[PDB]
């Protein structure tokens, strides 16, 4: 029964472990199991993981609201469609389902939902356009993007023909993919519908625009459906209050 | 006929094995619970016993009644049920005594040379003349209830036969009384004190000769 | 050691001579006059609607009549990978698009009716079909289900592994003249890739019932 | 007396150790012994262990209520006896001891009692039949099992002759052992008298049935006693609230 | 009414969270909707794992047993409070994985619920019906004074 | 049919009278005996007891290591005629395998008593 | 100043260390010394230890109350003296010192006192007899022991001549040592004056008896003094409430 | 489930760590980050240090 005199150590009592730690740590917990070791649910190859790797999610195209082109080559040198390029698409560019005195339900792409869960973002965005013509029709389109302008008031077919643009022949394919890169003064871009600043006080890090430049056997109306996914070099930064919520229950209680 | 491919007693689908009834008997279950009021206790009570709790691996004889319904509808736990299938045992118990509403100190003594006289616990005053106070030199354990209200103790198998008898009714059949008591002058509050005793098998425990199970009753027709 | 072998001790009965070929299933006809965005041409519990495509006069499906569904008559558990081909018939003077996607065990999600919108269909495994080129398009549907085997008969609702959608991505649009069509024809071919049946019983030991439709 | 400055560590105080851990762990406890090390009761070979290995318990046959066969080969092509095959035997297939306004006492087999302590189960079940004839009598029996039907309403001697069946000659032995395997759509089967669902809303993973196909020197009545034990490949899964209790005290307090 | 070892909440365990009722007297659900975990869960069809919980039960001073019933169907999408808890979950059971914590020592319970359930998957986005990892039960262990409020 | 099983120190269990039912006897070590073949059947009973030795005389009740059961598994059934028997005869042979005696005294130093029966 | 994030550990606070541990452990304590290490009182060979090894204590003979033999060879074939053989000697076999309304003081042997501190016991007991004759006298004595009888009602010179006995010639020495072995059905024997059972409801694991088979120059009376010590193979088992107490204060307070 | 009897150690509870220590020590703290290791803000040569010597 030898006496063990070792000096007591100073210890700081706290009520629990980290509420914020996701990775690279081991956390103590009382597991409600019969076995008292490090145990995990059994698996095979088919119930198998890393189906949540972000690049694998934001890679899936998501559909944006289809606009149409009406009566050809139509209106000489005109602006068809344009929007600020950033990971969450603008609420007017998204298939909506309104209901009266509930919230508005938006069919956001996979890239938009993932970017509502993070604080910053950066990298190229892919757009995939799908043209509802048939080879009889012809036209031309100038898709260009301008890197530092946030509002369409100032751009026109001769100002936008001096940026990086591809001229699309409207008959070489139905599915055309146009990548707008990431050209900014800064290394991470905040989201538009979380923080920081004041909603419509926002500046996207570029604009994408679609410019122009009538048979009776063929349908007059050519419909275009735009798809949007994140590029190969796209990343998200800090976990933040999700800008979105599930529409499981679309009810709300205004003040 | 063809045989069904194995999952190693569940290690393939869940994470663990389930091949021994000895392993389920190492998960605590309620042994006895009850209240002790101030009059029900003893008159000159300065270092005195509170319960004399006979230690059976097959548990106590459950009295099913209205004011605590874990015994009425669940009957007795998995440990009395596994124990009824075996004739002898050679091991100790693990206990957890959670004594509520008492703030000073609670000595717990183990009397391994005592016969198995009762199948119920003896409360307060009625505890015999020679178990009525803390003895000397018996294995004991005092715990101040302000620091921690849970006592974890392991009772050893100190008893002279080749076995200890399960399913019982010298008479040295088992591991004798455990005694729980207060260590000083205390205010026994109104509504007395509640003691909850949980138990399980220890790691040096065994079940030995397998006779049959007795006839069972189903929980589902208790109401 | 794979988990279909952990459900059934009896080995599987594999008859590739009478399964594993392209079977015709349905043909559906969509109009110029009710073809809008998100119009549902086909909304079926799959492969339940394909295998029970043959009906009685009293409307109970009988596996007995097609040599492809002959093992579905005599077993009770089954598992198989599928492929749905969709063919639309090429008319040059019209244009429109079809989107076909499959939703694993879709019918029991709490948000099922919200996932019909063709915006949401571009996120599950899908294929696109024109009327010009891109006539045929083959989907692929591996077996993914809660339990390693599906039930083949009732006692509810056997063989419901998902929901197959065919919707109008770009509306069926015509020229304004009389030589233009009022509709087209869309035909759905199915086949099974790894068909494993188990629990071989008689026939007439379990029954089928008149099948129920998705809302 | 050198000063030891080491930063205090964060510690989380809790009242006790795991209430659920049975295996693969070491638990701290205050042992009421004179010796302060890892000590265990002494042993020899004869007081020696693993007499509780589950396969060794569920291997022992347990008797189910004996039914009898009356006036031979008797009734042409008839159903003698049948029950759903699952580890707990049906309450009407078990030797009972009723008493008035107490509970009902059932002599469950060793396989039934062990399966009242677990949440899932799987694997083959052995039946051992014992015929109280003597070689003078003769008959035939078709024991078959059907893997996916839960109620006997639909089966008959020609429907059950198409399943896996053995035809037993009623004179080759008294003791006949018939193993019904495990053929299901799922990997673990819930018990019938614990959770989950609603008692008589249960589906066993198969049915076993016994079909048919009168001297004056021999006893008319042939009695059959069925025994049931778990097969060699049988397993149990999660510890759950025992469906049974000891009949030590068969008294009860209905609401 | 006769409440000596009784259940307090019967809490159905869903990875996609509960069906949020947004209301006036606790506004984390009204304005934040549901957290990042229901949102990530809605994108996937199945899951195979367990949960980690933290139950912080305030205004109670004795002991709080927490039991996990892995073989129970997914009957409700809301939690069941107090008395209404069914007849057979109304008290602490035997032999289920449980964990008692004295609330004077520490008011936070950290528990990990395992995946004990027989299918290849557990269903996310749900509405036998063995879809998930069944009820967790929280309860008091003795006679207590249930305070005002 | 006859079922014969042995219950180690059976007489002192609290549930003794419940374990007589022949359903419970099929779970302890047992043997089955017909009237046709399977006439003889030998049980085996190794020494298993609380203490390593049994007492041979009184001062209560020496040599009580268990209880031997012989019960009717399938009832004794006859043909309905007069050449049939009304009973049969069942004979029980014993023997001892490892007999160790210790504590050799005289005789007449301890007594026996008129033996008591199980209820 | 690098941040050290390590997950806090779960710890269970208790008020003290083991109250029961005597050996094979190290206990923490706050020592009231100037030196802060593992320190012990100084020693030499002469202040040196293990003078408490039990075998060394129970080896010392202790005297039991002397009985005498009166008027030789005396009464033909008679019982002189007999007692149950067990480590605590019977209270009527021990030198006593009564006092009125105090306790009774017993001069127990070294073997008796040590066996009042333990719960079980086993092994042989040595008796040493000392005869107060002188060579003129002669007689014979049959000391026998009987292994399983607890009361002397039934034994006599011809029943006790069939046990293990030595016939002592009463003149070969004064000091005769007679060892009764340990022959029982059990491996440890409870004590008679602690627990378990009911005092005079006790059975010693054997009896020892002394049987028989007058000058005027020599003293008529031969006095015999019996001594008792534990044999070489004697052991004690579990520490229990001492059956005895010091007579430092022989006062008491009856209820 | 072997019993582990090890004698409890004496420990002195205090509310926090050193208020005075600047250097040559490691201090425990609860970091409000997703990553649970020893993590520091990223750097290059130009955002680079000991400009406070």
Which residues on adjacent β-strands are paired with residue G121? G236
Min Cα separation A223/chain C (Å):
7
Q: Cα separation of D120 and E56, whole Å?
A: 32
In the structure, do chain D and chain C come into contact, i.e. share 3 or more CB pairs under 8 Å? yes
Of E102, E100, D238, D194, which is closest to residue B28 (Cα–Cα)?
A: E100
Report the number of secondary-structure helices (H) and strands (E) in chain B.
3, 12
Q: Which of C3, C6, C9 sits opposite B2 (nearest CB)?
A: C9
Give kind and range of the element (H or E) at residue A113.
helix A110-115
Task: Verify whether the Cβ–Cβ distance A23 to H14 is below 8 Å.
Answer: no
Q: Which pair of tokens denotes residue D194? A: 């614990």
Using a CB cutoff of 8 Å and minimum separation of 24, what contacts does D37-45 make? Answer: D37/G24, D37/G25, D37/H5, D38/H2, D38/H3, D38/H4, D38/H5, D39/B156, D39/B204, D40/B203, D40/B204, D41/B90, D41/B91, D41/B92, D41/B156, D41/B157, D41/B204, D41/B205, D43/B90
In the structure, do chain A and chain B come into contact, i.e. share 3 or more CB pairs under 8 Å? yes
Task: Judge whether H13 is closer than 8 Å to chain B, CB to CB.
Answer: no
Report the number of secondary-structure helices (H) and strands (E) in chain A.
2, 16
Q: Which positions in chain D have a beta carbon within 8 angstroms of at least one beta carbon in chain C?
A: 124, 146-150, 154-155, 159-160, 162-163, 181-187, 233
Q: Which residue of B has its CA nearest to E101?
A: B150
Q: Cα separation of G131 and G157, whole Å?
A: 21
Q: Is the peptide bond before A241 cis (omega within 30 degrees of 0)?
A: no
Residues of E with Cβ-Cβ distance to A16 under 8 angstroms: 54, 108, 110
Residues of B with Cβ-Cβ distance to H1 under 8 angstroms: 26, 202-203
Q: Which of D95, D134, D248 sits opposite F21 (nearest CB)?
A: D95
Residues of A with Cβ-Cβ distance to H7 under 8 angstroms: 4
Q: Cα separation of D148 and C77, whole Å?
A: 9
Task: Verify whether the Cβ–Cβ distance D7 to H25 is below 8 Å.
Answer: yes
Task: Verify whether the Cβ–Cβ distance C77 to D146 is below 8 Å.
Answer: no
Task: Judge whether C111 is closer than 8 Å to chain E, CB to CB.
Answer: yes
Task: Judge whether A40 is closer than 8 Å to chain B, CB to CB.
Answer: yes
Min Cα separation A13/chain B (Å):
14
8 Å CB contact between D70 and D221: yes
Q: Is the peptide bond before G11 cis (omega within 30 degrees of 0)?
A: no
* Strand ordering across the sheet containing F30-33: F30-33, F2-8, F66-72
Q: Is the peptide bond before G196 cis (omega within 30 degrees of 0)?
A: yes
Query: What per-residue string of b and e applies to A91-107 under the rule 16 or more CB within 10 Å gives b?
Result: eebbbeeeeeeeeebbb
Task: Judge whether D34 is closer than 8 Å to chain G, CB to CB.
Answer: yes
8 Å CB contact between E95 and D241: yes
How many residues are there in chain C?
A: 215
Task: Judge whether B203 is closer than 8 Å to chain H, CB to CB.
Answer: yes
Q: Cα separation of A84 and A82, whole Å?
A: 7
Q: Which residue of D has its CA nearest to B9?
A: D235
8 Å CB contact between C49 and C166: no
Q: Which pair of tokens denotes residue C98? A: 């079809």
> Method of determination?
cryo-EM
Give the HSE-up count for residue B184: Cα atoms under 13 Å, Cβ half-sphere.
8
Q: Cα separation of E145 and C67, whole Å?
A: 72
Q: Which of F22, F27, F74 sits opposite D223 (nearest CB)?
A: F74
| Total of domains in chain E | 1
Task: Verify whether the Cβ–Cβ distance G148 to F53 is below 8 Å.
Answer: no
Cα four-point dihedral sign A135, A138, A139, A140? positive
Q: Which of H10, H16, H30 sits opposite A8 (nearest CB)?
A: H10
Residues of A with Cβ-Cβ distance to B27 under 8 angstroms: 34
Residues of B with Cβ-Cβ distance to D103 under 8 angstroms: 217-218, 221-222
Q: Which chains touch D (3 or more CB pairs under 8 A)?
A: A, B, C, E, F, G, H
Beta strands in A24-183, from DSSP E residues, in sequence order:
30-31, 62-63, 67-69, 79-84, 96-97, 105-106, 121-122, 125-132, 141-146, 164-168, 175-180
Which residues of E, range 31-70, sit inside 8 Å of A by Cβ? Answer: 32-36, 38-40, 42-44, 48-50, 52, 54, 66, 68
For residue D85, with 0-12 CB atoms within 10 Å meaning exposed, 13-18 middle and 19 or more buried, which class applies? buried
Q: Cα separation of A134 and C131, whole Å?
A: 9
Q: What is the largest CA-CA distance in chain D?
A: 107
Task: Judge whether C97 is closer than 8 Å to chain A, CB to CB.
Answer: yes
Q: Cα separation of A9 and H12, whole Å?
A: 6
Min Cα separation B16/chain D (Å):
9
CB atoms closer than 10 angstroms to residue E138? 18
Residues of A with Cβ-Cβ distance to H12 under 8 angstroms: 8-11
Resolution of the experimentally solved model in angstroms: 3.4
Which residues on adjacent β-strands are paired with residue C188? C86
Residues of A with Cβ-Cβ distance to D20 under 8 angstroms: 30-34
Task: Judge whether H15 is closer than 8 Å to chain A, CB to CB.
Answer: yes
Residues of H with Cβ-Cβ distance to A235 under 8 angstroms: none
Task: Judge whether A28 is closer than 8 Å to chain D, CB to CB.
Answer: yes
Min Cα separation G35/chain A (Å):
10
Question: Domains of chain C by range and CATH?
Answer: 1-215 (2.60.120.20)
8 Å CB contact between D60 and D110: yes
Q: Is the peptide bond before D196 cis (omega within 30 degrees of 0)?
A: yes
Q: Which of G147, G154, G187 sits opposite F52 (nearest CB)?
A: G187
Residues of E with Cβ-Cβ distance to C151 under 8 angstroms: none
Q: Which residue of A has its CA nearest to C109?
A: A248
8 Å CB contact between C27 and C52: no
CB atoms closer than 10 angstroms to residue D100? 4
Query: Could you please report the per-residue DSSP string of chain G?
Result: --EE--PPEEE---S---SS--BS--EE----SS--SS------SSS---TT-HHHHHTS-EE---EEE-----STT-EEEEEE-SSSPPGGGS-EE--TTSPPEE---HHHHHHTSBS-EES-EEEEEEEE--TT----EEEEEESS---GGG--TTTGGGSEEEEE-SSS-SEEEEEE----SSS----SSSSSS-TTS---S-EEEEEE---SSS-SPEEEEEEEEE-TT-EE--B---S---TTS------
Q: Cα separation of F80 and F83, whole Å?
A: 9
Domain-wise residue ranges, chain G? 1-255
Task: Verify whether the Cβ–Cβ distance A35 to B17 is below 8 Å.
Answer: yes
8 Å CB contact between B64 and B33: no
Q: Cα separation of C76 and C158, whole Å?
A: 9
Residue B47 structural domain: 1-223
Coil, strand or helix at C210 = coil
């Amino acid at each position: 029964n030898p006496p063990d005199p070792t000096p007591a150590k100073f210890f700081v009592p706290i009520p629990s472990h980290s509420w914020a730690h996701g990775t690279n740590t081991s956390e103590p917990t009382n597991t409600l199991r019969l076995d008292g070791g490090v145990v995990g649910v059994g698996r095979s190859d088919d119930i198998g993981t890393s189906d949540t790797a972000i690049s694998g999610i934001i890679g899936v195209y998501g559909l944006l609201k289809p606009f149409d082109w009406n009566a050809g080559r139509n209106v000489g040198g005109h602006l068809l469609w344009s929007m600020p390029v950033h990971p969450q698409v603008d609420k007017d560019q998204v298939i909506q389902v309104m209901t009266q005195s509930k919230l508005t339900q938006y069919y956001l792409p996979p890239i938009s939902v993932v970017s509502s869960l993070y604080a910053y973002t950066r990298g190229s965005i892919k757009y995939k356009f799908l043209f509802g013509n048939n080879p009889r029709h012809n036209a031309r389109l100038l898709v260009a993007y301008i890197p530092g302008i946030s509002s369409d008031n100032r751009l026109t077919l001769e100002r936008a023909r001096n940026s990086a643009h591809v001229v699309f022949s409207l008959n070489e394919v139905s599915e055309f993919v146009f990548t707008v890169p990431y050209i900014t003064d800064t290394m991470w871009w905040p989201r538009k519908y979380g923080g920081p600043q004041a909603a419509g006080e926002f500046v996207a890090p570029s604009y994408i625009c679609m410019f122009i430049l009538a048979m009776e056997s063929v349908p007059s109306i050519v419909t275009i459906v735009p798809m949007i996914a994140a590029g190969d070099d796209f990343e998200v930064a800090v976990p933040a209050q999700p800008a979105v919520g599930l529409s499981r229950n679309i009810d709300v209680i205004y003040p | 006929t063809p045989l069904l491919p194995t999952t190693n007693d569940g290690r393939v689908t869940f994470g663990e094995a389930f091949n021994d009834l000895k392993d389920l008997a190492r998960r605590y279950q309620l042994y006895w619970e009850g209240t002790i009021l101030e009059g029900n206790l003893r008159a000159i009570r300065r270092n005195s016993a509170l319960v004399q709790l006979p230690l059976y691996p097959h548990g106590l004889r459950i009295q099913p009644d209205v004011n605590n319904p874990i015994w009425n509808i669940m009957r007795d736990g998995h440990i009395p049920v596994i124990s009824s299938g075996f004739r002898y045992f050679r091991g100790g118990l693990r206990l957890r005594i959670v004594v509520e509403g008492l703030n000073s100190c609670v000595w717990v003594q183990h009397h391994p040379d005592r016969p198995s006289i009762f199948s119920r616990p003896i409360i307060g005053r009625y505890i015999a003349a020679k178990d009525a106070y803390r003895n000397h030199a018996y294995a004991a354990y005092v715990q101040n209830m302000s620091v921690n209200r849970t006592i974890e103790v392991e009772v050893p198998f100190y008893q002279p036969g080749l076995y200890g008898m399960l399913n019982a009714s010298l008479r040295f059949t088992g591991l004798g009384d455990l005694l729980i008591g207060i260590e000083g002058e205390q205010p026994i509050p109104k509504e007395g004190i509640e003691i909850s005793v949980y138990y399980s098998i220890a790691d040096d425990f065994s079940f030995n000769i397998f006779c049959g199970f007795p006839p069972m009753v189903y929980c589902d027709e208790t109401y | 050691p794979t988990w279909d072998r952990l459900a059934s001790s009896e080995v599987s009965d594999e008859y590739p001579m009478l399964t594993d070929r392209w079977l015709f299933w349905k043909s559906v006809k969509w109009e110029v006059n009710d073809s809008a965005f998100g119009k549902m041409l086909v909304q079926e519990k799959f492969p339940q609607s394909w295998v029970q495509m043959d009906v009685n006069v009293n409307n109970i499906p009988r596996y007995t009549n097609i040599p492809n569904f002959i093992p579905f008559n005599i077993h009770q558990y089954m598992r198989a990978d599928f492929e749905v081909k969709i063919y639309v018939n090429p008319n040059d003077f019209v244009s429109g698009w079809l989107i076909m996607a499959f939703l694993y065990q879709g019918s029991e999600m709490f948000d099922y009716k919200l996932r019909r919108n063709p915006a949401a269909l571009m996120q599950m495994p899908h294929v696109l079909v024109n009327v010009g080129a891109a006539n045929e398009a083959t989907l692929k549907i591996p077996y993914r289900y809660v339990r390693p085997f599906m039930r083949c008969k009732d006692i509810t609702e056997p063989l419901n592994m998902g929901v197959l959608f065919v919707e109008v991505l770009i509306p069926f649009r015509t020229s304004a003249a009389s030589s233009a069509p009022k509709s087209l024809d869309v035909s759905l071919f199915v086949k099974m890739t790894n068909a494993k049946f188990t629990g071989m019983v008689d026939g007439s030991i379990a029954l089928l019932s008149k099948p129920i439709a998705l809302p």
